[PDB]
Design a protein around this ligand. Sequence first.
Ligand SMILES: [Mg+2]
Length: 235
Amino acid sequence: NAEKGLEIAQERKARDEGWGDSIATMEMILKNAQESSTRLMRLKSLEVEGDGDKGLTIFDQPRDVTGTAFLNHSHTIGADDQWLYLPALKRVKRISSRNKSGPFMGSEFAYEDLSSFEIEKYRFNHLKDEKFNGQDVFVLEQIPTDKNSGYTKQVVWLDKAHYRPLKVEFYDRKGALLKTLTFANYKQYLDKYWRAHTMAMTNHQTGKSTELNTSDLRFQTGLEENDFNKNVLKR
Ligand SMILES: [Mg+2]
């Protein structure tokens, strides 16, 4: 049912409400040749009344990315605002929504994967229940309403206990399975908010992969709206 899909999804969304802000210390691991390269970054996130999340990622290490920064303001309706800061020339570039499907800094995450999940961005459909990694899960489909998406659909395995994604399969514009995102090392914050400390995107067609690992997560650190102003990019 389309209406069970929507009900599940509204609950998934409702169970992740109220966290306010967070600062994550992170590692990005790119396995994008025959072998591996590692980046260090911080991700600041802010929950916004009546909108999508804002996120500011700043890369710290190694030298070829130090200072590079990515700012995202997710919108529920219409295009996200996205900007990339490159410190070499101190130029902020707006990322056009027509280009959201493109890869973010050579990784298996697209620009569009770095906005927050919002119910208004998809049409939902419950497919079936399944057992996955020994957890009871809902399997549901979400179809991006935006024609600029690189995806025809995503299929989400969502655990019944906590309504967390365990796996998301992404299908490309031609309908073919493109890549899978897995979530592991979930940890709960303020007795409510689940965050996956290990996330792995594997491209099946390519098969490059990108891991996102979190070593530390602080919530409600005092961040505010002006800390995500595009003018902050230049420091
Ligand atoms: Mg079912």
